[PDB]
Amino acid sequence: RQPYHYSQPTTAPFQAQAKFH
Amino acid sequence: RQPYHYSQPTTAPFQAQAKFH
Amino acid sequence: PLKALTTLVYSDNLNLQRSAALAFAEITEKYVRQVSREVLEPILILLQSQDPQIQVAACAALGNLAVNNENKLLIVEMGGLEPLINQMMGDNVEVQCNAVGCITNLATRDDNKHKIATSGALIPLTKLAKSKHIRVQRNATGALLNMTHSEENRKELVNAGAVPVLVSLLSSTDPDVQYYCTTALSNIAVDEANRKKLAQTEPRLVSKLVSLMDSPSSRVKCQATLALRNLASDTSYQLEIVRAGGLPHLVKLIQSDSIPLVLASVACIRNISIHPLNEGLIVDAGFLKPLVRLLDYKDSEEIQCHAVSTLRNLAASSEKNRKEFFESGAVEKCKELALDSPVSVQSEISACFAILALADVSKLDLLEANILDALIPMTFSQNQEVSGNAAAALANLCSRVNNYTKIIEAWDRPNEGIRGFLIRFLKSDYATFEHIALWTILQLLESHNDKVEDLVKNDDDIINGVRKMADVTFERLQRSGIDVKEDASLELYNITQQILQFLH
Amino acid sequence: GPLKALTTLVYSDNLNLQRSAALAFAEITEKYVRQVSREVLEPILILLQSQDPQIQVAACAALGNLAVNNENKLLIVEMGGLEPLINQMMGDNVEVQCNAVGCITNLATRDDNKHKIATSGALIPLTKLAKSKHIRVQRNATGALLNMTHSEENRKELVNAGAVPVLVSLLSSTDPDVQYYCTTALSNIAVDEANRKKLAQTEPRLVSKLVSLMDSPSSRVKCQATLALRNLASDTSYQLEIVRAGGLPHLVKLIQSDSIPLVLASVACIRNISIHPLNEGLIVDAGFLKPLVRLLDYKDSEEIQCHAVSTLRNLAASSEKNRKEFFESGAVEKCKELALDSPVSVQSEISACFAILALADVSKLDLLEANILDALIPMTFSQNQEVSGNAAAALANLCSRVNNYTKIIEAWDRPNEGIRGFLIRFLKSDYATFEHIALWTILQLLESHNDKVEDLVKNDDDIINGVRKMADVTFERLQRSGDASLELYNITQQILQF
């Protein structure tokens, strides 16, 4: 068989955070 | 006798009061 | 809400605290009532922070609270709101302002001012005014303006005195600072001590007052004129104000139709007219007729007294300018007014007549102004100044005059006339009045007018009165261990004998 | 304690009292945030729904600062805190725009909040305020949409609000945080095929912009743009499009980066792109080969190893002709070297790679004299079926139709019991596939016209005995039934005819 490692598209873990004033 | 009416110096009755911003 | 405001304050965290202070600022800013000690206590905690925001809100809140009377009295008790005032020294300028404000609002009460005068608090108040912003300076000038009310309060105004700051601040263009300053200095010049120091301390102050006598603001005008009067309580300034050409300002401030200005101006001109040297100047300036007519109006007797007095000291200083004194008809008007005016105005007019009737140059003219028509009834007065002075004037008018016609006319009429006067004053047991009567009778006999001689010598009542006066004085002198050949008795007796020598 | 001092200040109905309270809230939340009660939030909540703007900047700053903590996020969202913020987002005041959009950015970080964010229709105002001329607003806006790209259903109700074009244009923003948020947003969108197809027929130049960003001064932007490009290159369309947009020279310099994350992103991308056969010509001429080959040496990154080997395998799988460069790169020899001492991941990858190389008849001999049997043979032992299976297939193909059997004859016994051992082992297995491979292979050996291999196979007693037992087994199993069994039987019979 053929192996499938790390093949799928990635969702980036970084999320923004607000700054006020 | 000679009379002395209203002879004394006058102290003004007005008093100041402050102002704020 | 006070439960939440109080609990919010005690937190010790800056943010809840600036919140509390702002809240307090607004709620004090538009509704002012009587409030408890408990409300006050948080303010004290609020007062000391060194975030300036916190005291601008706290000092504005507290300053707003001041207008109700209770808060100012309440403020003194804590021992206090005083620590914040010491805090005022720190530079932040607008809480400088609001602290000075509360202190300006505070201390209106006398104990407050006396209390403030202790603790060396006001050395800063004098310091505060110079700062450039009008705001802080208005409060600073306001504050001690309010402290110039008690005598020893101004006595610690001169201690650590801001007085130089004040006289310099007279030339401010800002209206209210300069008004506060004029009123302050006016209030200071009430003391003899302060007046004596002001001549050689911060000299040239008066010239500034005289300049301020032409302000567009009525308030500054009036209060400056009153200041000048208070200074003119002393002779130094009585001359000094005149030197600065304060005469035209005063001469026309008097017919002003603003009555307070009239009162102030006439008061001032009276005080300066005290000094004899001034008389000449005052008369040459057109003061006379304004003074003359000014005295006539019924409503304000104080102006009447100031005017009559001014006229009297002008007359008393010099026999210069006397028919220059005559022309107005004020003497005719003093005559008309003496019969129908308050007892104040009466006694003033009285002293004036007594003064005019001394100069021999004017006795005849006074007599042909029918002055006896006022002098005679005035001698009836229950008021001793009126009756006394009127009597003296009358007595002088009978002495060594070149025409005795009007006296002969006024022998019987009006009011039982001169004859009646003599009898009345003899029948009194007032030594002074007895003397006046006896002396007058002698002066009449010593005139070589035959008619007068015959009225006095044939009047049984008058002759009888002198005889009883002679007996009474003789027996007072014989009980006291004296044979002729108090101290009033001897004099009186001698005059009785001189009079009775005309009989034979 | 202090809390209803402040709330009593809120219910006052006097504006200065409410701004005292609001400012207080803003600061006290600004420097300390934990999970808080429901009661603390309703005064903030309703107080916010007022239209003194000062109050709304303080309130939004407060609630937004609370929003950082996870249980405050849904508590805030669940009651219905959002409607006030959507209403302020639509409002013409720009700084309550800033802080409200801010709260939406901190809010919805949590997963199921987001679905209620979308069904609330917050993403229309969000999208339109991502155009703002004021940086603060755009930063919080694009940040918000970035955060909304995390769930799949969030992403497609992000696309049904057409926020994609705003993002794609904003890729060219000069502001670092805006363009980074936008790149990461688009990357996250490119995770779904549906979105990829829509991205194909809605944005023409997207790829170009992305390619441009591969030369950004910002490392995060470099990396994330590259990851985006990979996600797009999940599909064939973009696999061709990226090469057309000249993304190879960027990628080939990016794999030789001293930044391991950049290397990871670039090698993943080039793998996805190397999938397409047509690309091979170009990919080899950019000179990916030697960089990949030395990328096998990144012992500390197994993912990088897998991506590299996989890329080499797709290059090898697409075209026969250019292999000689593939042999000059040292890929075969380094794969051989690595196959004996590396993770089962890398093992299975290398295995499939050898299995691919061993199909082309032109290179079999070369592979044999590169001693590939010295790696293939022991690999057939592996417990991992991908490894052993692929290795076995490779070995089997290498014994079929070669003109020189020297190295096979040598690898008959050594190493690791050799090819002979392999055949025996796979026959004795009870796996149909492996039995098939063994029988087929020995048939291929006999079918070579080499005399020596012929007699190596038939004089080896164990081998032909195994074939006989396989034949017997297949026979008695199969005619109880009267076809894999049948094929194997046929092969055994084909063999036994020698």
> Following DSSP, what letter does each residue of C359-396 receive, concatenated?
-HHHHHHHHTTTTHHHHHHHTT-SSHHHHHHHHHHHHH
Please, is D80 exposed, middle or buried when counting C-beta atoms within 10 Å of its C-beta (0-12, 13-18, 19+)? Answer: exposed
The encoded tokens of residue D342 equal 């590396």
Tell me whether residues C101 and B16 touch, CB distance under 8 A. no
Taking only residues 97 to 116 of chain C, the set having a beta carbon closer than 8 angstroms to any beta carbon of chain B reads 97-98, 100-102, 104-105, 108
Test C23 with D9 for CB contact under 8 angstroms. yes
The whole-angstrom separation of Cα D345 and Cα D384 is 10
Which two tokens mark D319?
């075209």
CA-based nearest residue in chain D for residue C5 = D5
Contact B9, C188 (CB under 8 A): no
Resolution in angstroms comes to 3.2
Alpha helices (H) along D402-478? 406-410, 418-428, 432-447, 451-459, 461-478
Residue D307 structure tokens: 């991506």
DSSP per-residue letters across D263-313: HHHHHHHHHHHHTSGGGHHHHHHTT-HHHHHTTTT-TT-HHHHHHHHHHHH
User: Which amino acid is present at D223?
Assistant: C
Which tokens is C111 given?
């104990």
C53 touches chain B (CB under 8 A): no
Determine whether the interchain pair C7/D8 forms a contact, defined as Cβ–Cβ distance below 8 Å: no
What would the two tokens of residue C218 be? 């009525």
Give the Cα separation of D148 and D159 in Å (integer): 11
Q: Do D143 and A17 touch (CB under 8 A)?
A: yes
**Sequence-separated (6 or more) residues with CB below 8 Å from residue C59:** C47, C84, C95, C98, C99, C101, C102
* Of the candidates C317, C306, C257, the residue with the CA atom closest to the CA atom of residue C283: C317
- Least CB-CB distance to D2: which of C1, C8, C18? C8
Residue C390 CB contacts under 8 Å (≥ 6 apart), including other chains: C350, C353, C354, C374, C375, C376, C378, C379, C381
Rounded Cα–Cα distance for residues C385 and C438 (Å): 20
CA C190 to chain centre: 10
Query: Cβ contact (<8 Å) for C146 and B16?
Result: yes
Q: Which chain C residues are closer than 8 Å to B3 by Cβ?
A: 344, 347-348, 350-351, 385
B9 with C230: Cβ contact below 8 A: yes
Regarding chains A and B, contact by 3 or more CB pairs under 8 A is answered as no
- Cα torsion C6, C7, C8, C14: sign: positive
Using alpha carbons only, how large is chain A's radius of gyration in Å?
A: 17
Q: Burial-class residue D32 by CB neighbours within 10 Å (0-12, 13-18, 19+).
A: exposed
Q: Which two tokens stand for residue D297?
A: 């040496």
Closest-CA residue of chain D to A19: D102
Helix (H, G, I), strand (E, B) or coil at D11: coil
What CA–CA distance (Å, rounded) separates C306 from C284? 19
Technique that determined the structure? X-ray
Chain D residues 214-243 with a CB less than 8 Å from chain A: 224, 227, 230-231, 234
User: CA C98 to CA C104: how far, in whole Å?
Assistant: 9
Residues from chain B that touch C385, judged by Cβ atoms under 8 A, are: 1-3
Which residue type does D113 have?
N
> Tokens 């996870």 belong to which residue?
D70
Q: Give me the count of residues in chain C.
A: 504
Interface test with B, best of C135, C196, C273, C303 (most B CBs within 10 A): C135
Which chain D positions have a beta carbon within 8 Å of C22's beta carbon?
16, 19-20, 23
